[PDB]
């Protein structure tokens, strides 16, 4: 099958800017490409086939160009309404079909640094045997992060998830969530609890943290 | 009007049959293909296969040839895609979508709305909901977080408001994540004025109507 690669993973321009998004085909597929949008919850649309031709409800600031091997999409001066997934699919046999793996295309912003809390386990929790440590990165830009958990300064790997939200509407920022699991036991036998925030809004380091039973 | 409508969220276990419908209206759903596309969670789409309603013909992707059935009825305008003993990597959304002829020929003119599966060994839990304390430190004449962790509940979905809807600016409630156990967990959470902490109540009010779960959690400092 034909392989489609779109590039860059993720493009991040400023609204009114102009995006241009590229698609590879490891073989020649003449005209035959077709782009799609496709925003979180919903179905994809479709916006460009034959490589250059619009969709009837398709506004002029889309279009596409491209032939062979190697194809774009280029919106003219982004809207709120544009900022989504694109993926690409190519039909140059048709049924053969195959789709490129996405380009997410995000608002650039000025860079926030986060505001960052940690939440210790509630005694009500406790009485389960499990304790969740939570560790808050409020309204932050660029979605680059990293958060780091130690326990009395040991530096713990494989005992947390995170959760990151859909960039906000209004400021175009981001909040994460880190959770640290760990066992009653465990948690009654340790005393500091930190998470350590690097992010290329700040300086240095961010630690918040807390003593237990503190 | 020309739509393809999908059948509804199915929650299923590993090892069970599964059948989902897609019924196209306001066309002539027999001159035109349909194509099923499989988006796993956090990844891009997938091309199942397409079938011609109006007589049957399936023309498979090679990954997915052997390991679903689609099928068509074309007396109900419908097609359909089918697995006779599910797998927990089937989770994903499903969507059926018209191949254009004439128009936009050979691509996908018009898509349903998509059917989520969700295939796993976990029972239906309601959470138990806990709360995310506003610290003590919280600076005086600024602002402080507070939340709810509602912790390990199958299957999604839960909704989260603070005080019945009166709170909403600063709230943001995390997608959630799925743990090693099976189950599912998130927080919401909300910054407000430090100076607030003293005078005003925040509840966070959880639904999971799956196991038919409510419960309002009342946050304060310690």
């Known amino acids: 099958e034909i392989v489609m690669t779109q590039s860059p993973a993720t493009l991040s321009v400023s609204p009114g800017e102009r995006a241009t998004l590229s698609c590879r085909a490891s073989?020649?597929?003449?005209?035959?490409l077709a782009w799609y949008q496709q925003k979180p919850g919903q179905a994809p649309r479709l916006f460009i086939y034959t490589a250059s031709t619009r969709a009837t409800d398709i506004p002029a600031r889309f279009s596409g160009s491209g032939s062979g091997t190697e194809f774009t999409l280029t919106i003219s001066s982004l809207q709120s309404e544009d900022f989504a997934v694109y993926y690409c699919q190519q039909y140059n046999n048709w049924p053969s079909i195959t789709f490129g793996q996405g380009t997410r295309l995000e608002i650039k912003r000025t860079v926030a640094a986060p505001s960052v809390f940690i939440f210790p386990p509630s005694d009500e929790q406790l009485k389960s045997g499990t304790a969740s440590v939570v560790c808050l990165l409020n309204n932050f830009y660029p979605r680059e992060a990293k958060v780091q958990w130690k326990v009395d300064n040991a530096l713990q790997s494989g005992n947390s998830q995170e959760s990151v939200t859909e960039q906000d509407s209004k400021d175009s920022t981001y909040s994460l969530s880190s959770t640290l699991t760990l066992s009653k036991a465990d948690y009654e036998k340790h005393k500091v609890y930190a998470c350590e925030v690097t992010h290329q809004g700040l300086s240095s380091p961010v630690t918040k943290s807390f003593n237990r039973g503190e | 009007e020309v739509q393809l409508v999908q059948s509804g969220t199915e929650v299923k276990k590993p090892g069970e049959s599964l059948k989902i419908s897609c019924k196209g209206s306001?066309?002539?759903?027999?001159?035109?293909?349909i194509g099923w596309v499989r988006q796993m969670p956090g990844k891009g789409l997938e091309w199942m296969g397409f079938?011609?309603?109006?007589?049957?013909?399936?023309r498979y992707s090679p990954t997915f040839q052997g390991q679903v059935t689609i099928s068509a009825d074309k007396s109900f305008n419908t097609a359909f895609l089918q697995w006779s003993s599910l797998k927990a990597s089937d989770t994903a959304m499903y969507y059926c979508a018209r191949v254009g002829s004439g128009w936009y020929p050979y691509t996908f003119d018009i898509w349903g709305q998509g059917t989520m599966v969700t295939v796993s060994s976990a029972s239906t839990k309601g959470p138990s909901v806990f709360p995310l304390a506003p610290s003590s430190k919280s600076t005086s004449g600024g602002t402080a977080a507070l939340g709810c962790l509602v912790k390990d509940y199958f299957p999604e979905p839960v909704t989260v408001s603070w005080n019945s809807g009166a709170l909403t600016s600063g709230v943001h409630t995390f997608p959630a994540v799925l743990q090693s156990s099976g189950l599912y967990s998130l927080s919401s959470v909300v910054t407000v004025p430090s100076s607030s902490l003293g005078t005003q109540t925040y509840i966070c009010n959880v639904n999971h109507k799956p196991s038919n779960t409510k419960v309002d959690k009342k946050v304060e400092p310690k």
């Open positions: 073989e020649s597929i003449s005209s035959n």
């Open positions: 306001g066309y002539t759903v027999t001159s035109y293909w």
């Open positions: 079938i011609y309603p109006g007589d049957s013909e399936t």
